[PDB]
Coordinates of C-alpha atoms in Angstrom, one line a residue:
Chain A
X248 CA 6.8 1.7 19.3
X249 CA 9.0 -1.6 18.2
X250 CA 11.2 -0.7 20.9
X251 CA 8.0 -1.2 23.4
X252 CA 6.6 -4.0 22.0
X253 CA 9.7 -6.2 22.0
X254 CA 9.8 -5.6 25.4
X255 CA 6.4 -6.8 26.4
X256 CA 7.1 -10.0 23.6
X257 CA 10.2 -10.9 25.6
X258 CA 8.7 -10.1 29.0
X259 CA 5.4 -12.4 28.5
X260 CA 6.7 -15.0 26.4
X261 CA 9.9 -15.8 28.9
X262 CA 8.0 -15.6 32.4
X263 CA 4.7 -17.4 31.1
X264 CA 7.2 -20.5 29.7
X265 CA 8.7 -20.6 33.3
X266 CA 5.8 -20.6 35.0
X267 CA 3.7 -23.5 33.0
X268 CA 6.6 -25.8 32.5
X269 CA 7.0 -25.7 36.4
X270 CA 3.7 -25.8 37.1
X271 CA 3.0 -28.8 35.2
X272 CA 5.5 -31.1 35.7
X273 CA 4.8 -30.9 39.2
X274 CA 1.5 -32.2 38.3
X275 CA 2.1 -34.7 36.4
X276 CA 4.7 -36.1 38.9
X277 CA 1.8 -36.2 41.1
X278 CA -0.7 -38.0 38.6
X279 CA 2.3 -40.7 38.4
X280 CA 2.9 -41.1 41.7
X281 CA -1.0 -42.3 42.4
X282 CA -0.9 -44.1 39.6
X283 CA 2.1 -46.0 41.1
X284 CA 0.1 -46.2 44.5
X285 CA -2.6 -47.8 42.5
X286 CA -0.3 -50.1 40.7
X287 CA 0.8 -51.6 44.3
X288 CA -2.2 -51.7 46.0
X289 CA -3.2 -54.1 43.1
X290 CA -0.6 -56.3 43.3
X291 CA -0.1 -56.4 46.8
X292 CA -3.9 -57.5 47.0
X293 CA -4.2 -59.6 44.6
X294 CA -1.3 -61.8 45.9
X295 CA -2.1 -61.2 49.5
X296 CA -6.0 -62.7 48.7
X297 CA -4.6 -66.0 46.4
Chain B
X594 CA 3.8 -53.5 23.8
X595 CA 7.4 -52.1 23.9
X596 CA 7.2 -51.1 19.9
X597 CA 3.7 -49.2 21.7
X598 CA 5.1 -47.5 24.2
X599 CA 8.3 -46.5 22.6
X600 CA 5.7 -45.0 19.4
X601 CA 3.4 -43.5 22.5
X602 CA 5.3 -40.5 23.0
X603 CA 6.2 -39.1 19.8
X604 CA 2.3 -39.2 18.6
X605 CA 1.1 -37.5 22.0
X606 CA 3.5 -34.6 20.9
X607 CA 2.4 -34.4 17.4
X608 CA -1.3 -34.1 18.3
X609 CA -0.8 -31.9 20.8
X610 CA 0.8 -29.6 18.0
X611 CA -1.9 -30.9 15.5
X612 CA -4.7 -29.5 18.0
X613 CA -3.5 -26.4 18.9
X614 CA -2.8 -25.7 15.0
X615 CA -6.3 -26.7 13.8
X616 CA -7.9 -25.1 17.0
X617 CA -6.6 -22.0 15.7
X618 CA -8.1 -22.1 12.6
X619 CA -11.6 -22.0 11.5
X620 CA -11.6 -25.6 10.1
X621 CA -10.6 -29.2 11.6
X622 CA -8.4 -31.2 9.5
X623 CA -8.1 -34.8 9.4
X624 CA -5.6 -36.2 6.9
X625 CA -2.9 -34.6 4.7
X626 CA -4.5 -34.0 1.5
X627 CA -6.7 -32.1 3.3
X628 CA -4.5 -30.1 5.1
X629 CA -2.7 -29.1 2.1
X630 CA -6.3 -28.5 0.3
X631 CA -6.2 -25.7 3.5
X632 CA -2.8 -24.4 2.4
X633 CA -4.4 -23.2 -1.4
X634 CA -6.9 -21.9 0.6
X635 CA -4.9 -20.0 2.3
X636 CA -3.0 -18.6 -0.4
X637 CA -5.9 -17.5 -2.4
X638 CA -6.8 -15.5 0.5
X639 CA -3.6 -13.9 0.5
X640 CA -3.8 -13.3 -2.7
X641 CA -7.2 -11.4 -2.1
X642 CA -6.6 -9.3 0.8
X643 CA -2.8 -8.1 -0.7
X644 CA -4.9 -6.7 -3.5
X645 CA -7.3 -4.7 -1.5
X646 CA -4.2 -3.8 0.8
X647 CA -2.6 -2.7 -2.1
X648 CA -5.4 -0.6 -3.4
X649 CA -6.0 1.4 -0.6
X650 CA -2.6 2.4 -0.3
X651 CA -2.7 4.0 -3.7
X652 CA -5.9 5.7 -2.4
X653 CA -3.6 7.0 0.3
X654 CA -0.4 7.8 -1.6
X655 CA -3.1 9.9 -3.6
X656 CA -4.5 12.1 -1.1
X657 CA -0.9 12.9 0.3
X658 CA 0.0 13.9 -2.6
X659 CA -2.9 15.7 -2.6
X660 CA -2.7 17.1 1.0
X661 CA 1.2 17.8 0.2
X662 CA 0.4 20.3 -3.1
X663 CA -1.7 23.0 -0.9
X664 CA 0.8 23.2 1.9
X665 CA 3.1 25.9 1.1
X666 CA 4.6 28.6 1.2
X667 CA 1.4 29.9 -0.8
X668 CA 0.4 26.4 -2.1
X669 CA 1.6 26.1 -5.9
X670 CA 4.4 24.4 -7.5
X671 CA 6.7 24.9 -4.4
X672 CA 9.1 22.6 -5.9
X673 CA 11.3 25.1 -8.3
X674 CA 8.5 28.2 -8.3
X675 CA 10.1 30.1 -4.6
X676 CA 13.7 29.9 -5.9
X677 CA 12.2 31.5 -9.3
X678 CA 10.2 33.7 -7.6
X679 CA 13.6 35.3 -5.8
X680 CA 15.9 34.9 -8.6
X681 CA 14.1 37.6 -10.5
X682 CA 13.0 41.0 -8.7
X683 CA 9.1 39.5 -8.8
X684 CA 6.6 37.9 -6.1
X685 CA 4.6 35.0 -6.9
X686 CA 1.0 35.5 -8.4
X687 CA -1.1 33.2 -5.6
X688 CA 0.6 35.2 -2.8
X689 CA -0.5 38.5 -4.1
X690 CA -4.2 37.0 -4.2
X691 CA -3.6 35.4 -0.7
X692 CA -6.5 37.4 1.2
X693 CA -9.0 37.3 -1.1
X694 CA -12.6 35.9 0.0
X695 CA -13.7 32.9 -0.9
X696 CA -16.9 34.6 -3.0
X697 CA -14.1 36.0 -5.5
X698 CA -12.1 33.1 -5.4
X699 CA -13.9 30.8 -8.2
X700 CA -14.0 34.3 -10.2
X701 CA -10.7 35.1 -9.9
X702 CA -9.1 31.5 -10.3
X703 CA -11.6 31.4 -13.8
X704 CA -10.1 35.0 -14.4
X705 CA -6.6 34.1 -14.9
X706 CA -6.5 30.6 -15.9
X707 CA -2.9 28.6 -16.0
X708 CA -1.2 31.8 -15.2
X709 CA -3.1 31.5 -11.6
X710 CA 0.7 30.4 -10.3
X711 CA 2.8 32.7 -12.5
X712 CA 4.9 35.4 -11.3
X713 CA 5.2 38.9 -11.2
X714 CA 7.7 41.1 -13.2
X715 CA 7.9 44.9 -14.1
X716 CA 10.2 44.9 -16.7
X717 CA 10.0 41.4 -18.9
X718 CA 13.2 42.9 -20.3
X719 CA 15.6 41.8 -17.2
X720 CA 14.6 37.8 -17.5
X721 CA 15.6 37.8 -21.1
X722 CA 19.6 37.9 -20.6
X723 CA 18.2 35.0 -17.9
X724 CA 16.3 33.0 -19.7
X725 CA 18.5 30.9 -21.2
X726 CA 20.1 29.5 -18.4
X727 CA 16.3 28.2 -17.2
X728 CA 16.3 24.4 -17.9
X729 CA 14.9 23.5 -14.4
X730 CA 11.1 25.4 -13.9
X731 CA 7.8 23.8 -15.1
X732 CA 7.2 22.9 -18.2
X733 CA 5.1 26.1 -19.3
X734 CA 6.6 29.1 -16.5
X735 CA 4.2 32.3 -17.1
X736 CA 5.2 35.9 -16.2
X737 CA 3.3 38.6 -15.6
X738 CA 4.5 43.0 -15.4
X739 CA 3.1 45.0 -12.9
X740 CA 3.7 46.4 -9.9
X741 CA 4.5 43.8 -7.2
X742 CA 2.8 46.0 -4.2
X743 CA -0.3 47.5 -5.8
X744 CA -0.4 45.4 -9.2
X745 CA -3.3 46.5 -10.9
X746 CA -5.8 44.0 -12.8
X747 CA -3.6 42.9 -16.1
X748 CA -5.1 44.2 -19.0
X749 CA -7.3 41.3 -20.4
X750 CA -9.8 41.5 -22.7
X751 CA -12.0 39.8 -20.1
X752 CA -15.6 39.5 -20.4
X753 CA -18.2 37.9 -17.7
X754 CA -20.8 35.3 -18.4
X755 CA -23.1 33.2 -16.3
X756 CA -20.5 31.3 -14.2
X757 CA -17.6 31.5 -16.6
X758 CA -16.0 34.3 -18.5
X759 CA -14.5 35.0 -21.8
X760 CA -10.9 36.7 -22.5
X761 CA -9.0 37.4 -25.8
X762 CA -5.5 35.8 -25.4
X763 CA -4.5 37.0 -28.7
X764 CA -5.4 38.6 -32.0
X765 CA -7.2 35.3 -33.3
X766 CA -7.6 33.4 -29.5
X767 CA -10.1 33.5 -27.1
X768 CA -10.2 31.6 -23.9
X769 CA -13.5 30.5 -21.9
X770 CA -13.3 29.4 -18.4
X771 CA -15.9 27.7 -16.5
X772 CA -16.1 28.9 -12.6
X773 CA -14.3 26.0 -10.9
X774 CA -14.8 24.9 -7.5
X775 CA -12.6 25.2 -4.5
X776 CA -10.3 27.1 -6.3
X777 CA -6.4 27.9 -6.0
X778 CA -6.8 31.4 -4.8
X779 CA -7.8 33.0 -1.3
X780 CA -5.3 30.6 0.4
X781 CA -7.4 31.2 3.3
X782 CA -10.2 28.6 3.2
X783 CA -8.0 26.2 1.1
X784 CA -6.8 25.4 4.9
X785 CA -10.3 24.7 5.3
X786 CA -10.5 22.1 1.9
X787 CA -6.6 20.3 3.1
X788 CA -8.1 20.3 6.7
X789 CA -10.8 18.2 4.8
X790 CA -8.5 16.2 3.5
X791 CA -7.0 15.0 6.5
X792 CA -10.3 14.1 7.9
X793 CA -10.5 12.3 4.7
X794 CA -6.8 10.5 5.0
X795 CA -7.2 9.6 8.6
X796 CA -10.0 6.9 7.5
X797 CA -7.5 5.8 4.8
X798 CA -4.7 5.6 7.3
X799 CA -6.9 3.7 9.8
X800 CA -8.1 0.7 6.9
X801 CA -5.1 0.2 5.6
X802 CA -3.2 -0.4 9.0
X803 CA -6.7 -3.0 9.8
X804 CA -5.6 -4.7 6.0
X805 CA -2.1 -4.8 6.8
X806 CA -3.0 -6.8 10.2
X807 CA -4.9 -9.2 8.1
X808 CA -2.4 -9.9 5.5
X809 CA 0.3 -10.6 8.0
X810 CA -1.9 -12.7 10.3
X811 CA -2.2 -14.6 7.2
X812 CA 1.3 -14.8 6.3
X813 CA 2.1 -16.1 9.4
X814 CA -0.6 -18.8 9.8
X815 CA 1.2 -20.0 6.4
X816 CA 4.6 -20.3 7.7
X817 CA 2.5 -22.4 10.8
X818 CA 1.5 -24.9 9.1
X819 CA 4.9 -25.2 6.6
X820 CA 6.8 -25.8 10.3
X821 CA 4.8 -28.0 11.7
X822 CA 4.8 -30.3 8.1
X823 CA 8.5 -29.9 8.5
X824 CA 8.0 -31.6 12.0
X825 CA 5.5 -33.3 11.8
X826 CA 3.8 -35.8 9.3
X827 CA 6.4 -38.6 10.2
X828 CA 3.5 -39.6 12.7
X829 CA 0.5 -37.0 11.9
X830 CA -3.0 -38.8 11.4
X831 CA -2.0 -42.3 13.0
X832 CA -4.2 -44.4 15.6
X833 CA -4.0 -43.8 19.2
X834 CA -1.5 -45.8 21.3
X835 CA -3.2 -45.2 24.6
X836 CA -6.1 -47.7 23.5
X837 CA -3.9 -50.4 21.9
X838 CA -2.1 -50.3 24.3
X839 CA -4.8 -50.7 26.9
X840 CA -5.9 -53.7 25.3
Chain C
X1138 CA 5.0 -36.2 29.8
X1139 CA 3.0 -39.4 31.4
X1140 CA 5.7 -41.5 29.6
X1141 CA 9.0 -40.1 31.3
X1142 CA 10.6 -41.1 34.9
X1143 CA 10.4 -39.0 38.0
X1144 CA 14.2 -38.0 37.8
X1145 CA 13.7 -36.2 34.5
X1146 CA 10.1 -34.3 36.1
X1147 CA 12.0 -33.3 38.7
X1148 CA 15.5 -32.3 36.6
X1149 CA 12.7 -29.9 34.5
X1150 CA 11.2 -28.6 37.7
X1151 CA 14.6 -27.5 40.0
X1152 CA 15.7 -25.3 36.6
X1153 CA 12.5 -23.8 36.1
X1154 CA 12.1 -23.1 39.5
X1155 CA 15.8 -21.8 39.2
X1156 CA 14.8 -19.6 36.1
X1157 CA 11.2 -18.1 38.1
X1158 CA 13.8 -17.1 40.8
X1159 CA 15.4 -15.0 38.9
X1160 CA 12.4 -13.7 36.6
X1161 CA 10.3 -13.0 39.3
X1162 CA 12.8 -11.1 41.8
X1163 CA 10.9 -7.8 41.5
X1164 CA 7.9 -8.5 42.4
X1165 CA 6.0 -9.4 45.8
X1166 CA 2.8 -10.8 45.9
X1167 CA 3.8 -13.4 43.2
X1168 CA 7.5 -14.2 45.0
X1169 CA 5.2 -14.9 48.0
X1170 CA 3.5 -17.0 46.3
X1171 CA 5.9 -19.0 44.9
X1172 CA 7.6 -19.2 48.5
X1173 CA 4.7 -20.8 50.0
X1174 CA 4.2 -23.1 46.8
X1175 CA 7.7 -25.3 47.8
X1176 CA 6.2 -27.8 50.2
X1177 CA 5.3 -30.5 48.5
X1178 CA 2.9 -31.8 50.9
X1179 CA 0.5 -28.9 49.6
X1180 CA 0.2 -29.3 45.6
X1181 CA -3.0 -27.0 45.1
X1182 CA -0.5 -23.6 46.5
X1183 CA 1.2 -24.1 42.9
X1184 CA -2.1 -23.9 40.9
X1185 CA -2.6 -21.1 42.9
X1186 CA 0.5 -19.4 42.1
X1187 CA -0.5 -20.3 38.5
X1188 CA -3.6 -18.2 38.4
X1189 CA -1.5 -15.1 40.1
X1190 CA 0.8 -15.6 37.0
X1191 CA -2.2 -15.1 34.4
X1192 CA -4.2 -12.6 36.6
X1193 CA -1.0 -10.4 36.7
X1194 CA 0.1 -10.5 33.1
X1195 CA -3.9 -10.0 32.5
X1196 CA -3.8 -6.7 34.0
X1197 CA -0.6 -5.7 32.1
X1198 CA -2.1 -6.1 28.5
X1199 CA -3.1 -2.7 27.6
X1200 CA -6.3 -3.4 25.8
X1201 CA -5.8 -0.4 23.3
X1202 CA -3.6 -2.6 21.2
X1203 CA -5.1 -6.1 22.1
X1204 CA -8.0 -8.0 22.5
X1205 CA -7.3 -11.3 23.6
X1206 CA -7.5 -11.6 27.6
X1207 CA -5.3 -15.3 27.9
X1208 CA -1.6 -13.9 27.3
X1209 CA -0.5 -17.3 25.9
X1210 CA -2.9 -16.2 22.9
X1211 CA -1.6 -13.0 22.8
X1212 CA 1.9 -13.5 22.2
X1213 CA 1.2 -13.8 18.6
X1214 CA -0.7 -10.4 18.5
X1215 CA 2.7 -9.4 19.8
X1216 CA 4.3 -11.0 17.2
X1217 CA 2.0 -9.7 14.2
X1218 CA 2.4 -6.3 15.6
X1219 CA 6.4 -6.5 15.7
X1220 CA 5.8 -7.6 11.7
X1221 CA 4.3 -4.7 10.7
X1222 CA 5.8 -2.2 12.1
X1223 CA 9.0 -3.8 10.9
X1224 CA 7.3 -3.3 7.3
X1225 CA 5.8 0.3 7.7
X1226 CA 9.3 1.3 8.6
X1227 CA 10.5 0.7 5.1
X1228 CA 11.1 4.2 2.7
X1229 CA 9.3 7.1 1.9
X1230 CA 12.3 9.6 0.3
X1231 CA 10.1 12.1 -0.9
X1232 CA 12.5 14.8 0.1
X1233 CA 12.2 18.3 -1.1
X1234 CA 11.8 21.8 0.9
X1235 CA 12.9 25.2 1.0
Chain D
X644 CA 3.3 -14.6 -4.8
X645 CA 5.7 -13.4 -7.9
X646 CA 3.0 -14.8 -10.6
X647 CA 0.7 -12.7 -8.5
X648 CA 3.0 -9.3 -9.0
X649 CA 3.9 -10.1 -12.2
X650 CA -0.3 -10.3 -13.3
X651 CA -1.1 -7.3 -11.6
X652 CA 2.3 -5.5 -13.4
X653 CA 0.4 -6.8 -16.7
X654 CA -2.9 -5.3 -16.0
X655 CA -1.5 -2.0 -15.4
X656 CA -0.2 -2.2 -18.8
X657 CA -3.0 -3.0 -20.5
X658 CA -4.8 -0.8 -18.7
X659 CA -2.1 1.8 -19.9
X660 CA -3.2 0.3 -23.1
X661 CA -7.0 0.5 -23.0
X662 CA -6.2 4.4 -22.2
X663 CA -4.9 4.7 -25.7
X664 CA -9.0 4.5 -26.6
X665 CA -8.8 6.1 -30.6
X666 CA -7.5 6.0 -33.0
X667 CA -3.8 5.3 -30.8
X668 CA -3.8 7.2 -28.0
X669 CA -7.5 8.2 -26.7
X670 CA -8.9 12.2 -27.7
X671 CA -12.1 13.4 -26.2
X672 CA -15.4 13.0 -28.1
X673 CA -17.1 15.8 -26.9
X674 CA -14.2 18.1 -28.0
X675 CA -15.2 16.9 -32.0
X676 CA -19.2 17.3 -30.5
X677 CA -17.9 21.0 -30.2
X678 CA -15.9 20.9 -33.2
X679 CA -19.2 20.0 -34.6
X680 CA -20.9 22.4 -33.2
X681 CA -19.0 25.5 -34.6
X682 CA -17.6 25.8 -38.1
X683 CA -14.2 24.8 -37.6
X684 CA -12.0 21.5 -36.7
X685 CA -9.7 20.2 -33.7
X686 CA -6.9 21.5 -34.1
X687 CA -4.4 18.6 -33.2
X688 CA -6.6 16.7 -35.8
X689 CA -4.9 19.7 -38.2
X690 CA -1.5 18.9 -37.2
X691 CA -2.1 15.1 -36.4
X692 CA 0.9 14.3 -39.2
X693 CA 3.6 16.8 -38.2
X694 CA 7.0 15.1 -38.3
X695 CA 7.9 13.7 -35.2
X696 CA 11.4 16.0 -35.2
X697 CA 9.3 18.9 -34.9
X698 CA 6.4 17.1 -33.2
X699 CA 7.6 18.8 -29.6
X700 CA 8.8 22.2 -30.7
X701 CA 5.0 22.6 -32.0
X702 CA 3.5 21.2 -28.8
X703 CA 6.0 23.5 -26.9
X704 CA 5.1 26.4 -29.2
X705 CA 0.9 25.9 -28.0
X706 CA 0.9 25.4 -24.5
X707 CA -2.7 24.6 -23.2
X708 CA -4.1 25.8 -26.1
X709 CA -3.0 22.6 -27.8
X710 CA -6.3 21.4 -27.8
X711 CA -8.4 24.2 -29.4
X712 CA -11.0 24.3 -32.4
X713 CA -10.3 26.0 -35.2
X714 CA -13.1 28.4 -35.9
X715 CA -12.6 31.0 -38.6
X716 CA -15.9 33.6 -37.8
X717 CA -15.9 33.8 -34.0
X718 CA -19.3 35.3 -34.1
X719 CA -21.3 32.0 -34.1
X720 CA -19.4 30.9 -30.5
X721 CA -20.8 34.2 -28.8
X722 CA -24.3 33.9 -29.1
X723 CA -23.8 30.1 -27.8
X724 CA -21.2 31.2 -25.4
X725 CA -23.6 31.2 -22.5
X726 CA -25.8 28.0 -23.7
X727 CA -22.3 25.6 -23.3
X728 CA -22.0 23.8 -19.5
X729 CA -20.6 20.3 -20.6
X730 CA -17.6 21.9 -22.2
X731 CA -14.0 21.7 -20.9
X732 CA -13.8 24.1 -17.9
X733 CA -10.9 25.8 -19.7
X734 CA -12.0 26.3 -23.2
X735 CA -9.3 27.4 -26.3
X736 CA -10.8 28.7 -29.5
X737 CA -8.6 29.7 -32.5
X738 CA -9.5 31.6 -35.5
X739 CA -8.0 30.5 -38.9
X740 CA -8.8 28.7 -42.3
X741 CA -9.0 25.0 -41.0
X742 CA -8.2 23.6 -44.5
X743 CA -5.1 25.7 -44.9
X744 CA -4.2 27.0 -41.5
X745 CA -1.9 30.1 -41.3
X746 CA 0.3 30.5 -38.3
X747 CA -1.5 31.1 -34.9
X748 CA -0.4 34.6 -34.2
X749 CA 2.7 33.7 -31.4
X750 CA 5.8 36.3 -31.2
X751 CA 7.5 33.2 -30.9
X752 CA 11.7 33.2 -30.4
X753 CA 13.4 29.7 -30.8
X754 CA 16.0 28.9 -27.1
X755 CA 17.4 26.2 -26.5
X756 CA 15.2 23.2 -25.7
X757 CA 12.8 25.6 -25.2
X758 CA 10.2 28.8 -26.7
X759 CA 9.6 31.9 -25.1
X760 CA 5.9 33.6 -26.4
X761 CA 5.0 37.3 -26.0
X762 CA 1.3 36.1 -25.5
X763 CA -0.1 39.4 -24.4
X764 CA 0.7 42.8 -23.3
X765 CA 2.3 42.8 -20.2
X766 CA 2.8 38.7 -20.2
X767 CA 5.5 37.0 -21.4
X768 CA 5.3 32.5 -21.7
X769 CA 7.8 30.3 -21.4
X770 CA 7.9 26.8 -22.5
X771 CA 10.2 23.7 -22.7
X772 CA 10.5 20.6 -25.0
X773 CA 8.8 17.8 -24.2
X774 CA 8.1 14.0 -25.7
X775 CA 4.8 12.3 -27.0
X776 CA 3.7 15.8 -28.5
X777 CA 0.1 16.2 -28.7
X778 CA 1.0 17.6 -32.5
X779 CA 2.5 14.8 -35.2
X780 CA 0.9 12.3 -33.5
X781 CA 0.8 9.8 -36.6
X782 CA -1.0 7.8 -34.3
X783 CA 2.2 7.4 -32.6
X784 CA 2.2 3.8 -33.0
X785 CA 5.8 3.2 -31.8
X786 CA 4.9 4.0 -28.3
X787 CA 1.6 1.9 -28.5
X788 CA 4.1 -1.1 -29.8
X789 CA 6.3 0.0 -27.0
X790 CA 3.9 -0.7 -24.3
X791 CA 2.8 -3.9 -25.9
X792 CA 6.6 -4.7 -25.6
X793 CA 6.4 -4.2 -22.4
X794 CA 3.2 -6.0 -22.2
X795 CA 4.3 -9.1 -23.8
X796 CA 7.8 -9.7 -21.8
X797 CA 5.4 -9.1 -18.6
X798 CA 3.1 -11.8 -20.3
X799 CA 5.8 -14.1 -21.1
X800 CA 7.3 -13.6 -17.3
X801 CA 4.0 -14.3 -15.9
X802 CA 4.5 -17.6 -18.3
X803 CA 7.3 -18.9 -17.2
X804 CA 6.2 -18.0 -13.1
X805 CA 3.0 -20.4 -13.6
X806 CA 4.9 -23.2 -15.4
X807 CA 7.3 -23.3 -12.4
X808 CA 4.6 -23.3 -10.0
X809 CA 2.6 -26.0 -12.1
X810 CA 6.1 -27.8 -11.5
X811 CA 6.5 -27.2 -7.8
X812 CA 3.1 -28.3 -7.1
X813 CA 3.4 -31.6 -8.7
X814 CA 6.3 -32.6 -7.0
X815 CA 4.5 -31.8 -3.5
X816 CA 1.6 -34.0 -4.9
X817 CA 3.9 -36.5 -5.2
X818 CA 6.2 -36.5 -1.6
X819 CA 2.4 -36.1 0.3
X820 CA 1.6 -39.6 -1.7
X821 CA 5.2 -41.1 -0.5
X822 CA 4.4 -39.8 3.0
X823 CA 0.9 -41.3 2.7
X824 CA 1.8 -44.8 1.8
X825 CA 5.6 -45.5 2.3
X826 CA 6.7 -43.2 4.7
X827 CA 6.1 -46.2 7.6
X828 CA 9.0 -48.5 6.0
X829 CA 11.4 -45.5 4.6
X830 CA 15.1 -45.7 5.3
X831 CA 15.1 -49.0 7.1
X832 CA 17.1 -51.8 6.2
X833 CA 16.9 -54.6 3.9
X834 CA 14.8 -57.6 6.2
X835 CA 16.6 -60.7 3.7
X836 CA 19.5 -60.2 5.9
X837 CA 17.5 -61.2 8.8
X838 CA 15.8 -64.1 7.0
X839 CA 18.7 -65.3 6.7
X840 CA 19.7 -65.4 9.7

């Protein structure tokens, strides 16, 4: 039993970690890109109007 | 803004770990002192669950020991009795009465009393030289004389009574035995009773499994909180930087 | 991660992908999804890959001994099982027979 | 955890000592009632004062019959026998003078650390020397005191562990308060130099 459960735990713990990091990092990078786009739009808008 | 920005990521990591930790528990934490008091409650639950675990363990040990006494070869004080049975030209009495029915089993068990698990040896003088060597034996060994193959009822001054038996063991000595239930002799249905005991012990094993699992859960919860405070208090429960940066 | 520059985020993403390629080598469904995920112009594909992973794990939980549907929560139960089993392994030593 | 462990063992010892109900080492009161119902006396009560040196020998000699009533008549029991139901499942009775109890009929022969008794026709019984014999009790106060010594050792160990835990908790509270009120400035440099600049 200890052998089987050891294998299952190792598989779960490694695969879940890699999937989570790979997905979440890209998700946050998109969030930051959108923030940068909004900041650029507002800055250029402001100085253009003024 | 620079100070707040440098501070922010640490506070955010700490908050994520804290939220995960408290959500994992039933109670919600709000301060250092609160976390400490939760530590104490966790310890109390440890030391209660462990007591129930140990008590159930004691019952399980008793059950296995009881089952084991009824096992083999003809359930008896098997540790030494089998060797003691062959080291003399004799046969174990309980083995001679292996086949008796359930109706006569209580009668015979009352009749033979403590001597149920003695050995039959037809001379009892051939043991006299061997006897001095017996340093490894039950504290009270019983020996009987008769034909092992067609052993006649040992001459007892026996007398049947209502649900009991009277016997004169010696001049100026009498023994009075009340009919027990589920006896030694008749080791055909005594397997029936050990079957009942197996059914009983299954439940104890299951319950013990659950209790041990619970104790391990509590111990790991304490480990998690200790790890947390080791890595976390420097910024725990501080004010949110997102708000102040926005301001 | 909100307080980091994009270079570090990409470094983590790339190294995670490097690990994933090996982890997912044998499976085909997950391998197809991961393959589809790497075009930057279609973000939802990555979350779809994540969903595939979670469903695939949920089938393998073996609820005979476990009950949580979320695998991440199931890790703790595997840990508890390891501790308990290692404790049961200790000893009995009441050895004496014919 | 350790202080709880010691408390559990001390409970076990206290339970064992409590099991020494009366006078020092429990004796079944039901047997006293039975000895009252028939003219006679409990055998252990007759030999409760014999020397500790010979006590194991006597206990080996009597075997299961150690707990029994000395009834010199045996005529009172037989009519009352079918009336006995609350009695112990294996009741033992012996005939002799309770005041001056002559040696019971045993064809007893003494072996090295053991006794052999020809109980009946075609029956011998063999027994080895035990400890804590039922006879020669003399209250066996020395065993009660040995158990008391063990119990007091456990109590002392428990006391030390409780004291230690109290110390540790006090240190913990001190640190909690410190990080509650000085952590923000802990390990920083002296501001006087900067003020001078």
